[PDB]
Symmetry: D3
Subunit: 273 residues, 6 copies
């Protein structure tokens, strides 16, 4: 398990010195519980919930696969194990769930509001500390694709890196030999004129930072023109509304980091019996 | 440093095999950069930012103390160190910042909308996985107090625990001897009649789950009545609006977990030069 | 699980580069062995031991639960599993069963002199490095009760703390808003006058330090009339003889941390048979 | 370094979610502090403390060395750092100086009552969990000498191991080619007979477990006679009231694990000034 | 920092319970020492070494940067610091400088035969356990270039993968939406026919496995007319003689992972002087 | 256990952010696989593999033992688990079986060309970083024997250490009381003279570093003469073309660290079926 520790840690920060309830409890027995929802939405974080549960000695009788949709008063999980242990895990479970689910839902919404089957939805390294993965996985279980996961994943730069370079074309070449063979080089651009110097130099990918439909199409055009095998990325602010408009800019994928840093939880709770 | 690793981990998940930019860079030099804002709001996470920075070999020339307020186009930090290293830390810094700042702001707002100096604002164990502390600290730098930090912090129960007990009073006594001496026992209650069985039994604290003003006042009353030294907690949903109404229920503190699981980031970015 | 890593490290230290015997052992085989007393005492350590065994792959046949009493020559545990693993888990097993039971035993000898069903006996924060929780556990299996476990569990102030404090009453006031909601505040006082002040400032617990049986009965009495809701504990070089007296002095609880820093091993050993 | 992680852990167990007093302190500041003794004994732990101090950014002004003797009321250490920290570090620093010194002292007693500049006094493997290295280190300062540290250190066969070895001379011969090149073997014997055999098999050290001062003499002789470079160690329940007695029997070392599993805390405390 | 913990563990393993010499060393003192060649080669390991030194408290006086060439009897490093620490960091230091330079050296011997400024030499994923990154680094200081570093760095498919795949072209299509946006896809092909298929399905990189110089020049040519935007690499038991030929065969890069699993130490040693 | 964390790490370095193929796989499923040899040699690593397998929930159907000989095309292991996993685990499993077997093989060569049932062949401390234990283990299977494992194992003084010791007989005598009770000392000598001295001082093992087969004979004699229980080890740049030569000189063991720092991967691969 690559996430075995992640859970390990999440549980400890809440258990600290050790749960207080178990000290008082006299006779521990084996009971059962459900994870009803309280607000319709999608569901992500199954994988984790499963791992955590087996990791704690909690049997997962019934579960609703990820990527699935639900409505309030719906049973999402019939877990069963010792009583004491059940209560310790209660919170850590709901939490990771609600957070994963939430980003998944808020992401779901961005999907339909895209309406397309030839354009990709991407996220960003804009993630909460220590959740680079836990979240991207969530962005996924919504219907979007994930962009790069780290800074070793694919060399991607912007002005900040080139504000001291002469001859771009010649630059992207002295990199190729000083990089990993299977790494693409994506570049950020703020104006039409840039996208050109880009492609020309080699750029495996070209982004579009804060630029209007007609500003992009000129590039989406100049692209279909000479450099065809060079993906294009619409990335600026991309509001939930101005998102559909860009799908039409004839651009491969649009990255809306807001998918992650804008997703609140989703009501859920746990009841014994 | 108790948070030294927290940062340690946050940086790695993004660096993975190792940043790709540094491979290409030819001559590394020492430059400087700022952390301008892009949306007025409060600021939290100074502590971390500081630690991270020294941890990375980045000098923190100028910083704006936590709990402070800011407006767009404002410089929040003049950091200076090697160029390569500056870029690796760029993201991990903004992230933890924006997230801490965000909860701080959304919390700030809940403060003024409370208007009071005798009533406390509390949060909940409703926190994102692996951020139990990173967040509570944020809830703090907003103006609120923190409730319990874990399940070892203070024995607090609800129906779920008592749906199998006879004689509450006698119960809270066989706990005291099987608990840590400095631990209070807070109890959750959903109806007037409960608050009574509570106090009577001993309960060091009594909460109020999803109950209207007049429902609470009856208890806030019966409290000022016989059991005075028994704090009272208003905790249900407490919308940003129906929050002020409860301040008047004559209750010690009100806990609005929404403070954490509802706070999105806050625009910020980093520019060289 | 929380004590996995504890046990894990307790083993790692003894094996080092690896056991040498398993290098020369020709044919490993399943064998049974028992842990046995060689002196009388009260049993502590089950929790830890069972977890060690089931961790290493050794089956546990029979075990005397914690708190139980045992005479010498008594068989305490029966265990089966690979010969090689038994000889590795041997000292690691015994060692903790001894250090653990050693405390618990020396603890009941106090719980005796104490002799009361209204007064609680408490340990302290004076514990051997890395065994805080371990040792605290033991004290429980000794018949007494644990005080706090850390500096986050509850706020406690003594001379060193106050020497830099003006107007205490005003302090414990503008403190509650920066401490976690459930947190109790306790104060060490070396005299009656100090005692009154504390209680008044709004202390939750007052500690009667190195004070004569009398001075306590008085700081006690004063408390049963002006502040009945305050906790009082007596501490300071209390012994097996003088401990009895304090019990009968109207004082909430007594803390003789010696129950730990003055407890030694209880000779035990393991035989194959 | 080496023990940095030990201290790193010893602290994390006491701090937990975080120190409380540091939440309510108003203005931290630099300050001095002294560790005074309240009991006479011998000082151990220097090694550890100095790292604990530097590790937590505290300055060490003055400090006595390991093995130095001290009287009560003696000022042992002069530390100087931020008031807030000095406090978090206090108990830890003391706990470990009391445990370490505690051991060294009791040890120093056995070394005096042993009386002899040619016979070594040894500890064992009976140690408290997670302190193997620490406690050995302690014994060292008390003026005695360490036995092996773990199971990789050197091979020792007690009866348990032997009860399955037909022909020992071979077993030892056909074990050398497996055990690392530089390892000694030690066999536990309970009769002049066993020791006479064990030695021909080629043991490198012979344990004279629970034997009369006469039998021991016998073996010491046979040793000085036919096997000179063998090495003798007398062990078993040995106490002050019999050490000197065994010292004069020819054995090269007397082994008494009571040195650690029977040692206790030497009273100490920290003052500000 | 990323290689701290690497070095940290490389030390921990050699010291075990702790160095024995520092136990018998009477007076420690500051001394200087040099690491020296005893055979010719290309230098690798600086990054790691400097970090080891400055980590242990040893000053570095002079050092031959990485990639540099050196003859025997040449002085490679001058270091000052506590005698005791020098003797501990000794083998740990040498060992990695050797294993590291050993690779790099054996690598340049290939970069030679290769002889080209249009073709890149690449390592593989066949590395010694725990040294993936370490060894990959070395290969760089050998004059070549690294292939991918993990199974997250980029998707690669070989026989074993395809045996359970129907209609590949359709696969690489409904895959891009589940792979991270930047991810390149590469395919191992054991023949011309396989090669075409790959390219067509939309592969980003095709690997020419155990194929004759010719069959490559052909899978090459075909590619310089129908798919000019595809990467081609040749692999499979390539050696120091036959490696030259492939260079001149219109193929993007060559991957002879032997540059690692077939590289040994380069005799070096350290002298005090 | 012991090495679980080694494997846990070896995997985490290759997986990184996560395996890609597992993102695009459609329906995972159980499957078998064989590890076939493509070179003749001797099998090492069994110990590790079986843990890697069980650790990642893969079933081991059949497997050859450590030290068993194998020819090419020989099927060495039959594993059976989820297709997805079998793949993540593939390279690791092979990498470590190739490194381990690689060593054992070269070793097995020296053991044959050594020829002698009474002279031990030893490795050293010259090992690759983080594999000290692993590589020693490997040498073991090759049929040779391990020297000490670290600096805690036993004390060895080379010239460096000695260059400051006036009077060695004393130094060794007044070092015994510090070093653990069961430790051997070994001194490096470069002349019949040094060895004659070192032995009186009381060394327990004497290194005959870089000496003629004649000088070695000389020392071996003096050894058999005046110091019988001393132990001789010949070392230095020794190769197949001179082993048998030294074996017949009286020394108890020949030390050749080339066994590991010169060993390479033995070709192996994994097939599905
Ligand atoms: O390196 C990455 O993971 C990465 C991938 C895609 C986009 N970004 C950055 O994220 C920015 C958009 O953020 P947002 O949430 O306001 O749409 C974009 O224009 C870049 O400056 C960063
Ligand atoms: O144990 C805790 O840390 C804890 C502290 C305060 C409140 N809670 C729970 O959080 C609930 C309120 O959540 P919210 O965000 O909708 O206001 C409350 O009524 C309880 O069921 C939990
Ligand atoms: O910090 C704590 O949890 C704590 C709780 C109770 C007592 N103490 C300290 O421990 C002292 C008594 O030690 P002793 O010899 O009675 O084990 C007492 O008078 C204080 O100075 C410390
Ligand atoms: O494992 C060791 O290093 C070791 C070394 C010497 C002796 N022992 C055992 O410790 C026993 C004596 O216990 P004590 O009360 O002197 O700590 C002895 O007779 C053996 O059964 C164990
Ligand atoms: O997974 C990778 O990164 C990877 C990259 C390039 C090559 N390989 C494998 O390594 C094989 C060649 O090994 P060798 O003897 O040329 O070092 C090749 O034909 C594949 O089966 C594996
Ligand atoms: O540290 C050890 O365990 C150790 C044991 C035996 C020999 N050495 C050193 O290793 C040297 C021989 O190197 P080699 O090529 O046989 O690996 C020898 O003459 C010493 O300087 C080192």
């Amino acid at each position: 398990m690559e996430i075995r520790t992640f859970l390990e840690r999440a549980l400890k920060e809440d258990l600290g010195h050790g749960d207080l309830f178990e000290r008082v409890l006299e006779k521990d027995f084996k009971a059962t519980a459900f994870v009803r929802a309280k607000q319709e939405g999608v569901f992500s974080g199954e994988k984790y919930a499963l791992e955590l549960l087996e990791m704690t000695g909690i049997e997962c009788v019934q579960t609703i696969k990820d990527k699935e949709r639900f409505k309030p008063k719906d049973a999402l999980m019939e877990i069963r194990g010792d009583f004491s242990m059940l209560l310790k895990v209660e919170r850590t479970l709901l939490n990771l769930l609600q957070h994963s689910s939430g980003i998944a839902t808020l992401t779901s919404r961005f999907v339909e509001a895209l309406n397309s089957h030839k354009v990709r939805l991407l996220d960003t390294r804009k993630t909460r500390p220590l959740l680079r993965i836990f979240e991207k996985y969530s962005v996924l279980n919504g219907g979007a694709s994930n962009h790069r996961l780290g800074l070793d994943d694919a060399l991607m730069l912007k002005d900040t890196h080139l504000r001291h370079v002469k001859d771009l074309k010649s630059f992207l070449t002295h990199a190729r030999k000083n990089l990993p063979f299977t790494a693409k080089i994506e570049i950020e651009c703020e104006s039409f004129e840039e996208a050109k110097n880009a492609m020309n130099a080699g750029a495996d990918i070209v982004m579009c930072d804060n630029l209007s439909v007609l500003e992009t199409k000129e590039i989406a055009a100049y692209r279909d023109a000479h450099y065809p095998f060079v993906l294009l990325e619409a990335s600026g602010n991309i509001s939930l509304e101005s998102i559909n408009a860009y799908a039409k800019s004839g651009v491969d994928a649009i990255s809306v980091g807001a998918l992650i840093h804008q997703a609140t939880f989703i009501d859920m709770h746990m009841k014994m019996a």
